[PDB]
Amino acid sequence: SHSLRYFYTAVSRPGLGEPRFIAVGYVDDTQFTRFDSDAPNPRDEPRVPWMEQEGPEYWDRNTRIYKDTAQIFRANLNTALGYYNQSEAGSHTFQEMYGCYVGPDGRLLLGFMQFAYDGRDYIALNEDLRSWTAADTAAQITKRKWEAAGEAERQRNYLEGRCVEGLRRYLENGKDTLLRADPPKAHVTHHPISDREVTLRCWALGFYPEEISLTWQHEGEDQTQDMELVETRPSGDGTFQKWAALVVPSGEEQRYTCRVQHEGLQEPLTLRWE
Amino acid sequence: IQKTPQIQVYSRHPPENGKPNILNCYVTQFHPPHIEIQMLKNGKKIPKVEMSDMSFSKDWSFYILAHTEFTPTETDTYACRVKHDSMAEPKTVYWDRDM
Amino acid sequence: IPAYGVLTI
């Protein structure tokens, strides 16, 4: 399953001018575009090397879309102050994420479009793409308004059409890197805790995509209950890294193995401290 | 309304003393988006620290990757310090070669 | 390509 997703953030800054608006585009988990209203030259730009086929008109068009949206988000933040009777004095945030997940049949699997005010659900487009869920009484005003205006239909048309067409195109264009699989470079380290115990750490670096399985075992038995894990983290170069650790008795390290599995392998890799 | 930043500090490649590397400070799950991140070498702020674009997750919380070039030595130590309204005082995490 | 901005709230 693949997706095209856009993320918008507007942050008000009283006494400092208009809100800053930032829009970021994602194909699957890869950031591929960015617009920042605060940039010396506020323009939508590629954040990836494989978007070079698009013309100047492409980025010009996106830029104007985001500029128009920035204006809307400013209005949204002002309106929210009224709805919630809040002061013009404080900073507030308004966020949107929307996009399309496509099934192997090449058609929309799930379209979504959600909004948040100050980091909490405000209003969202339901899965049927024909109705809204309002999170509170303020958002119920918006719901009434968007229902009267027939907003849902236009969003559904986008999610089912342009969004899907775009994903198809970008996936095709970024194919060589988006769909690649770089296997992890994995190894085991050994760190004494005390006289009785030591830490065995199973490392995996430089892998893509980010999904990976690291499983400590004791004489063949799955020990995925006593492992210490870190959340998979970005290497900074587009790859990911992660480790899984187990505390074992000193002198019994040889009884344990780390099983590493990832798309870029073929079959599991079995590692051990020796 | 206020979410506390989680911090991981780690090198891009396994550290080898004398070999150029990249030090990462990965800061996640915070709100509001305003945040002040710095990285320190031997207790002193590093001026040359790049920041990724800030984005947010499915839960609406923000995240960002701070990074800087460094060449690990046997004595040089490193930290990442984060200031955010969700915390009374800034939070520091020290780089540990073993993690 | 992004969608055109949704109606104001």
CSV table of N, CA and C in Angstrom, one decimal, chain A residues 45-149:
chain,number,residue,atom,x,y,z
A,45,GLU,N,9.1,23.7,-3.1
A,45,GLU,CA,10.4,23.2,-3.7
A,45,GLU,C,10.5,21.7,-3.4
A,46,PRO,N,11.3,21.0,-4.3
A,46,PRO,CA,11.5,19.6,-4.1
A,46,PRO,C,12.5,19.4,-2.9
A,47,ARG,N,12.3,18.3,-2.2
A,47,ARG,CA,13.1,17.9,-1.1
A,47,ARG,C,13.8,16.6,-1.4
A,48,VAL,N,13.8,16.2,-2.7
A,48,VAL,CA,14.1,14.9,-3.1
A,48,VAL,C,14.6,15.1,-4.6
A,49,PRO,N,15.6,14.2,-5.0
A,49,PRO,CA,16.2,14.4,-6.3
A,49,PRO,C,15.3,14.0,-7.5
A,50,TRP,N,14.3,13.2,-7.3
A,50,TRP,CA,13.5,12.6,-8.3
A,50,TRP,C,12.2,13.3,-8.8
A,51,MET,N,12.1,14.6,-8.5
A,51,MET,CA,11.0,15.4,-8.9
A,51,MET,C,11.4,16.4,-10.0
A,52,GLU,N,12.5,16.1,-10.7
A,52,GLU,CA,13.1,17.0,-11.6
A,52,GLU,C,12.3,17.1,-13.0
A,53,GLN,N,11.5,16.1,-13.2
A,53,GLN,CA,10.7,16.1,-14.5
A,53,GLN,C,9.7,17.1,-14.6
A,54,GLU,N,9.2,17.6,-13.4
A,54,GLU,CA,8.1,18.6,-13.4
A,54,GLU,C,8.6,20.0,-13.9
A,55,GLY,N,7.8,20.7,-14.6
A,55,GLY,CA,8.2,22.0,-15.1
A,55,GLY,C,8.1,23.1,-14.0
A,56,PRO,N,8.6,24.3,-14.4
A,56,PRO,CA,8.5,25.5,-13.5
A,56,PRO,C,7.0,25.8,-13.1
A,57,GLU,N,6.1,25.5,-14.1
A,57,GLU,CA,4.7,25.8,-13.9
A,57,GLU,C,4.1,24.9,-12.7
A,58,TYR,N,4.7,23.7,-12.6
A,58,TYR,CA,4.3,22.8,-11.5
A,58,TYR,C,4.5,23.5,-10.2
A,59,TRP,N,5.7,24.0,-9.9
A,59,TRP,CA,6.1,24.6,-8.6
A,59,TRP,C,5.4,25.9,-8.4
A,60,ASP,N,5.3,26.7,-9.5
A,60,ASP,CA,4.5,28.0,-9.5
A,60,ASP,C,3.0,27.7,-9.1
A,61,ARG,N,2.4,26.6,-9.7
A,61,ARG,CA,1.0,26.3,-9.4
A,61,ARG,C,0.9,25.9,-7.9
A,62,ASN,N,1.8,25.0,-7.4
A,62,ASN,CA,1.8,24.6,-6.0
A,62,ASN,C,1.9,25.8,-5.1
A,63,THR,N,2.9,26.7,-5.4
A,63,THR,CA,3.2,27.8,-4.6
A,63,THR,C,1.9,28.7,-4.4
A,64,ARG,N,1.2,28.9,-5.5
A,64,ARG,CA,-0.1,29.7,-5.4
A,64,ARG,C,-1.1,29.0,-4.6
A,65,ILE,N,-1.2,27.7,-4.8
A,65,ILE,CA,-2.1,26.9,-4.0
A,65,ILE,C,-1.9,27.1,-2.5
A,66,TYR,N,-0.6,27.0,-2.1
A,66,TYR,CA,-0.2,27.2,-0.7
A,66,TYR,C,-0.3,28.6,-0.2
A,67,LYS,N,0.0,29.6,-1.0
A,67,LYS,CA,-0.2,31.0,-0.6
A,67,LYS,C,-1.7,31.2,-0.4
A,68,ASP,N,-2.6,30.7,-1.3
A,68,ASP,CA,-4.0,30.8,-1.0
A,68,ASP,C,-4.5,30.2,0.3
A,69,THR,N,-3.9,29.0,0.5
A,69,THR,CA,-4.2,28.2,1.7
A,69,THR,C,-3.7,28.9,3.0
A,70,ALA,N,-2.5,29.5,2.9
A,70,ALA,CA,-2.0,30.2,4.0
A,70,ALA,C,-3.0,31.3,4.4
A,71,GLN,N,-3.6,32.0,3.4
A,71,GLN,CA,-4.5,33.1,3.7
A,71,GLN,C,-5.7,32.5,4.4
A,72,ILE,N,-6.2,31.4,4.0
A,72,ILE,CA,-7.3,30.7,4.6
A,72,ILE,C,-7.0,30.3,6.0
A,73,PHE,N,-5.8,29.7,6.3
A,73,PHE,CA,-5.4,29.3,7.6
A,73,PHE,C,-5.3,30.5,8.6
A,74,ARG,N,-4.8,31.6,8.1
A,74,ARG,CA,-4.8,32.9,8.9
A,74,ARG,C,-6.2,33.2,9.3
A,75,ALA,N,-7.2,33.2,8.3
A,75,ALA,CA,-8.6,33.4,8.6
A,75,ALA,C,-9.1,32.4,9.6
A,76,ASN,N,-8.6,31.2,9.5
A,76,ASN,CA,-9.1,30.1,10.4
A,76,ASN,C,-8.6,30.4,11.8
A,77,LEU,N,-7.4,30.8,12.0
A,77,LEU,CA,-6.9,31.1,13.3
A,77,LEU,C,-7.6,32.3,14.0
A,78,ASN,N,-7.9,33.3,13.1
A,78,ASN,CA,-8.7,34.4,13.7
A,78,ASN,C,-10.1,34.0,14.1
A,79,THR,N,-10.7,33.2,13.2
A,79,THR,CA,-12.1,32.7,13.5
A,79,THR,C,-12.1,31.8,14.8
A,80,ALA,N,-11.1,31.0,14.9
A,80,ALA,CA,-11.0,30.1,16.1
A,80,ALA,C,-11.0,30.9,17.4
A,81,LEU,N,-10.3,32.1,17.4
A,81,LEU,CA,-10.3,32.9,18.6
A,81,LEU,C,-11.7,33.4,19.0
A,82,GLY,N,-12.5,33.7,18.0
A,82,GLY,CA,-13.9,34.0,18.3
A,82,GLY,C,-14.7,32.8,18.8
A,83,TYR,N,-14.6,31.6,18.2
A,83,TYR,CA,-15.3,30.4,18.5
A,83,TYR,C,-15.0,30.0,20.0
A,84,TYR,N,-13.7,30.2,20.4
A,84,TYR,CA,-13.3,29.8,21.7
A,84,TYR,C,-13.1,30.9,22.7
A,85,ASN,N,-13.5,32.1,22.2
A,85,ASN,CA,-13.3,33.3,23.1
A,85,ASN,C,-11.9,33.4,23.7
A,86,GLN,N,-10.9,33.3,22.8
A,86,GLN,CA,-9.6,33.4,23.3
A,86,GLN,C,-8.9,34.8,22.9
A,87,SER,N,-7.9,35.1,23.7
A,87,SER,CA,-7.2,36.4,23.5
A,87,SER,C,-6.4,36.5,22.2
A,88,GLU,N,-6.2,37.7,21.7
A,88,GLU,CA,-5.4,37.9,20.5
A,88,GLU,C,-3.9,37.8,20.9
A,89,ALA,N,-3.7,37.6,22.2
A,89,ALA,CA,-2.3,37.7,22.8
A,89,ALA,C,-1.4,36.5,22.6
A,90,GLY,N,-2.1,35.3,22.6
A,90,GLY,CA,-1.3,34.1,22.6
A,90,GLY,C,-1.2,33.5,21.2
A,91,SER,N,-0.1,32.6,21.0
A,91,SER,CA,0.1,31.9,19.8
A,91,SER,C,-0.8,30.6,19.8
A,92,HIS,N,-1.4,30.3,18.6
A,92,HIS,CA,-2.2,29.1,18.4
A,92,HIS,C,-1.8,28.4,17.1
A,93,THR,N,-2.1,27.2,17.0
A,93,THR,CA,-1.8,26.4,15.9
A,93,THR,C,-3.0,25.8,15.2
A,94,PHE,N,-2.9,25.7,13.9
A,94,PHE,CA,-4.0,25.1,13.1
A,94,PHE,C,-3.3,24.2,12.1
A,95,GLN,N,-3.7,22.9,12.1
A,95,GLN,CA,-3.0,21.9,11.3
A,95,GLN,C,-4.0,21.1,10.5
A,96,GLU,N,-3.5,20.6,9.3
A,96,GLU,CA,-4.3,19.8,8.5
A,96,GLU,C,-3.4,18.7,7.9
A,97,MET,N,-3.9,17.4,7.9
A,97,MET,CA,-3.3,16.4,7.1
A,97,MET,C,-4.4,15.7,6.3
A,98,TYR,N,-4.0,15.5,5.0
A,98,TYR,CA,-5.0,14.8,4.1
A,98,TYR,C,-4.2,14.0,3.1
A,99,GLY,N,-4.9,13.1,2.4
A,99,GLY,CA,-4.3,12.4,1.4
A,99,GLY,C,-5.0,11.1,1.1
A,100,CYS,N,-4.3,10.2,0.3
A,100,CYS,CA,-5.0,9.1,-0.3
A,100,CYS,C,-4.1,7.9,-0.2
A,101,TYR,N,-4.6,6.7,0.3
A,101,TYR,CA,-3.9,5.5,0.3
A,101,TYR,C,-4.5,4.7,-0.9
A,102,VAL,N,-3.7,4.1,-1.7
A,102,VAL,CA,-4.2,3.4,-2.9
A,102,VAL,C,-4.0,1.9,-2.8
A,103,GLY,N,-5.0,1.2,-3.2
A,103,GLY,CA,-5.0,-0.3,-3.2
A,103,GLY,C,-4.3,-0.8,-4.4
A,104,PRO,N,-3.9,-2.1,-4.4
A,104,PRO,CA,-3.2,-2.7,-5.5
A,104,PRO,C,-4.0,-2.7,-6.8
A,105,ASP,N,-5.3,-2.5,-6.6
A,105,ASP,CA,-6.2,-2.4,-7.8
A,105,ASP,C,-6.1,-1.0,-8.5
A,106,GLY,N,-5.2,-0.2,-7.9
A,106,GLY,CA,-4.9,1.1,-8.5
A,106,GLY,C,-5.9,2.2,-8.1
A,107,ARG,N,-6.8,1.9,-7.2
A,107,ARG,CA,-7.9,2.8,-6.8
A,107,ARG,C,-7.9,3.1,-5.3
A,108,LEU,N,-8.5,4.2,-5.0
A,108,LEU,CA,-8.6,4.7,-3.6
A,108,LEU,C,-8.9,3.6,-2.6
A,109,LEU,N,-8.1,3.4,-1.6
A,109,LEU,CA,-8.3,2.4,-0.5
A,109,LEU,C,-8.9,3.2,0.6
A,110,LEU,N,-8.3,4.4,0.9
A,110,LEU,CA,-8.7,5.2,2.0
A,110,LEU,C,-8.3,6.7,1.7
A,111,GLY,N,-9.3,7.6,1.7
A,111,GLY,CA,-9.0,9.0,1.6
A,111,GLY,C,-9.3,9.6,3.0
A,112,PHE,N,-8.5,10.6,3.4
A,112,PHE,CA,-8.7,11.2,4.7
A,112,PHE,C,-8.4,12.7,4.6
A,113,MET,N,-8.9,13.4,5.5
A,113,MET,CA,-8.7,14.9,5.6
A,113,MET,C,-9.1,15.4,7.0
A,114,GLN,N,-8.1,15.6,7.8
A,114,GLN,CA,-8.3,15.9,9.2
A,114,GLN,C,-7.8,17.3,9.6
A,115,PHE,N,-8.4,18.0,10.5
A,115,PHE,CA,-7.9,19.3,11.0
A,115,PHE,C,-7.8,19.3,12.5
A,116,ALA,N,-6.8,20.0,13.0
A,116,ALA,CA,-6.6,20.1,14.4
A,116,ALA,C,-6.4,21.6,14.8
A,117,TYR,N,-6.9,22.0,15.9
A,117,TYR,CA,-6.6,23.3,16.5
A,117,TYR,C,-5.9,23.1,17.8
A,118,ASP,N,-4.8,23.8,17.9
A,118,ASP,CA,-3.9,23.7,19.1
A,118,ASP,C,-3.6,22.2,19.4
A,119,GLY,N,-3.3,21.4,18.4
A,119,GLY,CA,-2.9,20.0,18.6
A,119,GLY,C,-3.9,19.0,19.0
A,120,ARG,N,-5.2,19.4,18.8
A,120,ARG,CA,-6.3,18.5,19.1
A,120,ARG,C,-7.3,18.4,18.0
A,121,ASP,N,-7.9,17.2,17.8
A,121,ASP,CA,-8.9,17.0,16.8
A,121,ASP,C,-9.9,18.1,16.7
A,122,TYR,N,-10.1,18.7,15.6
A,122,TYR,CA,-11.1,19.7,15.4
A,122,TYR,C,-12.3,19.2,14.5
A,123,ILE,N,-12.0,18.9,13.3
A,123,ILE,CA,-13.0,18.3,12.4
A,123,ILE,C,-12.3,17.4,11.4
A,124,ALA,N,-13.0,16.3,11.0
A,124,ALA,CA,-12.4,15.4,10.0
A,124,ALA,C,-13.4,14.9,9.0
A,125,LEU,N,-12.9,14.5,7.8
A,125,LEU,CA,-13.8,13.9,6.8
A,125,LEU,C,-13.9,12.4,7.1
A,126,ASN,N,-15.1,11.9,7.2
A,126,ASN,CA,-15.3,10.5,7.5
A,126,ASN,C,-14.8,9.6,6.3
A,127,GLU,N,-14.7,8.3,6.5
A,127,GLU,CA,-14.2,7.4,5.5
A,127,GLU,C,-15.1,7.4,4.3
A,128,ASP,N,-16.4,7.7,4.4
A,128,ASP,CA,-17.3,7.7,3.3
A,128,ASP,C,-17.1,8.9,2.4
A,129,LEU,N,-16.3,9.9,2.9
A,129,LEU,CA,-15.9,11.1,2.2
A,129,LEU,C,-17.1,11.9,1.8
A,130,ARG,N,-18.2,11.8,2.6
A,130,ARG,CA,-19.5,12.5,2.3
A,130,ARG,C,-20.0,13.1,3.6
A,131,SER,N,-19.3,13.0,4.7
A,131,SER,CA,-19.7,13.5,6.0
A,131,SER,C,-18.6,13.8,6.9
A,132,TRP,N,-18.8,14.7,7.9
A,132,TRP,CA,-17.8,15.2,8.8
A,132,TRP,C,-18.0,14.7,10.2
A,133,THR,N,-16.9,14.6,11.0
A,133,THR,CA,-17.0,14.4,12.4
A,133,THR,C,-16.4,15.6,13.1
A,134,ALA,N,-17.2,16.3,13.9
A,134,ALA,CA,-16.8,17.5,14.6
A,134,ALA,C,-16.5,17.1,16.1
A,135,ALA,N,-15.3,17.6,16.5
A,135,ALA,CA,-14.8,17.1,17.8
A,135,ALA,C,-15.3,17.9,19.0
A,136,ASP,N,-15.9,19.1,18.8
A,136,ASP,CA,-16.4,19.9,19.9
A,136,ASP,C,-17.5,20.8,19.4
A,137,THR,N,-18.0,21.7,20.2
A,137,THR,CA,-19.1,22.5,19.8
A,137,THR,C,-18.7,23.6,18.8
A,138,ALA,N,-17.5,24.1,18.9
A,138,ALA,CA,-16.9,25.0,17.9
A,138,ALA,C,-16.9,24.4,16.5
A,139,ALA,N,-16.4,23.2,16.5
A,139,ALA,CA,-16.3,22.5,15.2
A,139,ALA,C,-17.6,22.1,14.6
A,140,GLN,N,-18.7,22.1,15.5
A,140,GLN,CA,-20.0,21.8,15.0
A,140,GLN,C,-20.5,23.0,14.2
A,141,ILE,N,-20.1,24.2,14.5
A,141,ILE,CA,-20.4,25.4,13.7
A,141,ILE,C,-19.8,25.2,12.3
A,142,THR,N,-18.5,24.8,12.3
A,142,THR,CA,-17.8,24.6,11.0
A,142,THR,C,-18.5,23.5,10.2
A,143,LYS,N,-18.9,22.4,10.9
A,143,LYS,CA,-19.6,21.3,10.3
A,143,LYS,C,-20.8,21.8,9.6
A,144,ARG,N,-21.7,22.5,10.3
A,144,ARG,CA,-22.9,23.1,9.7
A,144,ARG,C,-22.5,23.9,8.4
A,145,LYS,N,-21.5,24.7,8.5
A,145,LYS,CA,-21.1,25.6,7.5
A,145,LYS,C,-20.6,24.8,6.2
A,146,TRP,N,-19.8,23.8,6.4
A,146,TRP,CA,-19.2,23.0,5.4
A,146,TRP,C,-20.3,22.1,4.7
A,147,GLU,N,-21.3,21.8,5.5
A,147,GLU,CA,-22.4,21.0,5.0
A,147,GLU,C,-23.3,21.8,4.1
A,148,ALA,N,-23.6,23.0,4.5
A,148,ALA,CA,-24.3,24.0,3.7
A,148,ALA,C,-23.6,24.3,2.4
A,149,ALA,N,-22.3,24.4,2.4
A,149,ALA,CA,-21.5,24.8,1.3
A,149,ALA,C,-21.2,23.6,0.3
